[PDB]
Ligand binder design. Structure first.
Ligand SMILES: Cc1ncc(COP(=O)(O)O)c(CN[C@@H](CCCCN)C(=O)O)c1O
Ligand SMILES: Cc1ncc(COP(=O)(O)O)c(CN[C@@H](CCCCN)C(=O)O)c1O
Lengths: 384, 384
């Protein structure tokens, strides 16, 4: 959780960092490159890079997005925008959530295209562009797939009207329409798509604006890889980039490993308890590892008496409550674990693996919900 | 999360922050002044400032610590220490968890007193001081309340022996004995104190130790407040400083509020469902507020269709799965809610209140499990 950053770059080493997150530079390029070919010049790529690149370091990943000349980049937070631009990405850059107004105003300087899903929203945002002399480009979000989140519900006549006035805006230039698929099911994406289609068609036709000057973009990762017809003009892909997408497509390589150190290993007696509130009772006569990681560090409380790490290839049980900065793990079966070893909180360790599958199960929600904040709470460090 | 930062300083402002953590400098400055009094100058005070000050900004909490002549600070990570010193705090600086050697070593530059819990750990560490020409000051950790965590187990001769060789180390000034308590409970905390006493007595004796050179220091916050006799030479408080301690002690004030904005408000019709996986169906023609905060932001997935947030003092419910960046709430009952409105996700807003108790409920862990990380994934902004 570095306390000094210069556009995503810290001064930290693996040596002097307590727990760290390893972005694989290589897996990255292999993922970009693979998508780029699978897509096949039938579609463009926005690399979906919000959440600081899903906890991978927008600043760390920007090199490689530039490297594989990816044309487009989605962000969410204003900083993500500053950093992309400050990397020299002279390309298309779009926000993939609604902003707040003040926020959006600041953003103006970064020349980002802004998402709009409502006429009242549109209206204000317009007066903000007028105010600065600038012309602001906008993606119109359409609730085609049923998210009820960013975009206008073009299902009812009200929406269709709201949609019109979004385009009546004299200081906003319209340049896309979009929806985002809501269920990761083939059939359900397929309806979403059929809807997005009529609604685009409808709005294009009836607001006498023209195809040629818009990009229509609905496909997320799962959508791109599974319902390719849903590709259309451009796709925005987070997960797949980083190798958590459809578990079956194993050509998409994990980009992020989460790791800590072993502080030291202590002995304890039969009948001791471990961590707050005496949750675990020591069954035999034990050796424990003080691992320099906690919930402060990201490794959440919910892993209490449930989770496992890897050390020296060894699958090793988390024991007792997870303290704020220190994790306790039973090495009582593994005499070969020693001070300064390397803990793998998530990933593979020559032999072993902590599965995304098994961590999600413990957590109660998807893995992003953990790793996008592991990102925030530790140093991201480039590798391969 | 600011992507550029200096010692925990950022050019981020409530205007362009998408969500953010407000640290109340009076809530702080009060809380310290309160302890310092309640203590009566009869017992020394460490500001336990770990996890970047329990997610409050450590480089933020510092200038007040310095100005109130708090003599000691307790940090966890190396950066935390760098920043304490960067800030001009000059006095006693201990680490409250075993470090791993590489990390311990890097830290030598900051003059920190290091926690030590076993003979082997000690000798190793002796080695490093040795190599460096330094005399490292060490706090011995006892397992008196039986956390089984950093503390040498003194309930067993072998362990007892370990203690003794920890003290036989040539290159380490042993300068405290401490332990930490496992149950926030008047009785269990007492047993542990009584234990800790005989063990400190014993060590001082058998190791032939100048009592006037040791700090005997055991009490956390709860212990300090609820069990005076455990104050001994010094205490170690975080929660209290931040107003997250014994709910009953209301003289200690919350120093943190969690906050975000309304993106805009969309009319979605009955029958629509909200967010990934159709988790929620609209029983009525709704007005849904789009909030520029999400699980990547720290506001985690556990709150799907569970949470409440305040706008204009209104208890408004989370609807649909908390997405990565945006959060959807139901303002159909609350037409005062417009775009741009400030949102409390945790705290108080004119007359309403999002209680620690009600969030812990849904989380399943103490509030620190959430908010130490809110700290990390959001900019912290000083107030009052
Ligand atoms: C509007 C939008 N466009 C593109 C993407 C990229 O999708 P992908 O990562 O699934 O390829 C997202 C992901 N944001 C999701 C994360 C979905 C979790 C799956 N990785 C959210 O808001 O929760 C998105 O919200
Ligand atoms: C060794 C030690 N000493 C003192 C404290 C300060 O406790 P206080 O916050 O009650 O003043 C801690 C905090 N670490 C704990 C406390 C949780 C914070 C909730 N109060 C942990 O690792 O969960 C600690 O690990």
């Amino acid at each position: 959780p570095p306390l000094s950053m210069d556009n995503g770059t810290n001064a930290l080493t693996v040596q002097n960092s307590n727990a760290w997150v390893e972005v694989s530079a290589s897996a990255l390029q292999h993922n970009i490159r693979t998508l780029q070919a699978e897509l096949a010049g039938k579609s463009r790529l926005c690399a979906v890079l919000k959440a600081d690149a899903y906890g991978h370091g927008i600043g760390l990943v920007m090199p490689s997005i530039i490297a594989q000349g990816v044309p487009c980049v989605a962000v969410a937070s204003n900083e993500e925008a500053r950093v992309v631009r400050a990397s020299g990405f002279t390309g298309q850059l779009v926000r993939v959530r609604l902003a707040s107004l003040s926020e959006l105003e600041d953003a103006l300087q970064y020349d980002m295209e802004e998402l709009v899903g409502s006429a009242e929203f549109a209206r204000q945002v317009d007066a903000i562009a007028a105010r600065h002399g600038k012309t602001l480009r906008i993606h119109m979000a359409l609730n085609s797939s049923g998210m009820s989140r960013n975009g206008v519900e073009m299902a009812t006549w009200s929406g269709r009207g709201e949609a019109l006035q979004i385009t009546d805006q004299k200081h906003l230039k319209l340049v896309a329409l979009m929806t985002h698929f809501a269920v990761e099911d083939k059939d359900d994406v397929r309806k979403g798509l059929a809807a997005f289609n009529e609604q685009t068609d409808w709005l294009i036709k009836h607001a006498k604006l023209d195809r040629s000057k818009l990009t229509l973009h609905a496909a997320n990762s799962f959508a791109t890889l599974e319902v390719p017809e849903a590709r259309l003009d451009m796709v925005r892909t987070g997960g797949a980039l980083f190798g958590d997408t459809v578990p079956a497509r194993t050509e998409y390589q994990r980009a992020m490993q989460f790791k800590s150190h072993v502080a030291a290993v202590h002995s304890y007696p039969a009948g001791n308890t471990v961590g707050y509130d005496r949750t675990f009772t020591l069954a035999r006569d034990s050796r424990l590892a003080n691992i320099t990681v906690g919930y402060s560090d990201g490794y959440r409380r919910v892993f209490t008496n449930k989770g496992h790490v890897l050390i020296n290839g060894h699958r090793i049980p988390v024991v007792g409550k997870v303290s704020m900065n220190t994790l306790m793990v039973d090495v009582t079966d593994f005499p070969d674990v020693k001070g300064g070893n390397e803990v793998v909180l998530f990933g593979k360790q020559a032999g072993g693996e902590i599965t995304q599958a098994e961590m999600e199960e413990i957590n109660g929600a998807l893995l992003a919900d953990l790793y996008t904040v592991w990102g925030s709470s530790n140093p991201k460090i480039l590798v391969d």
